[PDB]
């Protein structure tokens, strides 16, 4: 089972929508942070610590939890440095699982309601 992550719903989201985040093929017994990310610049991503969460992969490398997404949020860099406001209406945002060393499967892109 290859490392993968699934997020649903992933489209038609609103600020406050709760999504299901699931991971498979992960490190058995490893704790994974669940967070919303955004590419704030080429090769630069910021996340939303204000609504982050954590989940530990089971003996089978599977995990699943919930996450509240935000249309816009105060983004922080990987090292905790404050970046600034991020608007997922335009910015490319995703939800991802990452362990303490920054490893984990590819994040899943998300989009918000346009109405
Ligand atoms: C940034 C990091 C991976 C992403 C982590 C971060 C700790 C805090 C954190 C909380 C979240 O909600 C998402 C993941 C994340 C933002 C980790 C601390 C070290 C780890 O990265 C590395 O081990 C390698 C660092 C590097 O390559 O310089
Ligand atoms: C931010 C990050 C690189 C970009 C990652 C992010 C985890 C979530 C994520 C999922 C993707 O599929 C796209 C990249 C990305 C958004 C990582 C968590 C730690 C890692 O970073 C660093 O270790 C050092 C900074 C860097 O690599 O530029």
Curated annotation (Swiss-Prot):
GO terms for biological process: defense response to bacterium. The keyword DNA-binding applies. Disulfide bonds join 37-47, 88-93. It comes from the Bacteria. GO terms for molecular function: DNA binding. Keywords: Antibiotic, Antimicrobial, Disulfide bond, DNA-binding, Signal. The keyword Transcription regulation does not apply. Belongs to the neocarzinostatin family. NCS has antibiotic activity (for Gram-positive bacteria) and antitumor activity (for certain mouse tumors). NCS binds non-covalently to a chromophore which is the cytotoxic and mutagenic component of the antibiotic. The chromophore binds to DNA as a weak intercalator and causes single- and double-strand breaks. This is Neocarzinostatin. The chain holds residues 35 to 147 of 147 of the full protein.
């Amino acid at each position: 089972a290859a490392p993968t992550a699934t997020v649903t719903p992933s489209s038609g989201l609103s600020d406050g929508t709760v999504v299901k985040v699931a991971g498979a093929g992960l490190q058995a017994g490893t704790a994974y942070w669940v967070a919303q990310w955004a590419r704030v610049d080429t090769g630069v991503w910021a996340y939303n610590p204000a609504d982050n969460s954590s989940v530990t992969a089971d003996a089978n490398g599977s995990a699943s939890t919930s996450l509240t997404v935000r249309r816009s949020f105060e983004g922080f860099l990987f090292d905790g440095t404050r970046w600034g406001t991020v608007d997922c209406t335009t910015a490319a945002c995703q939800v991802g699982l990452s362990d303490a060393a920054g490893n984990g499967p590819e994040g899943v892109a998300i989009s918000f309601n346009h109405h």
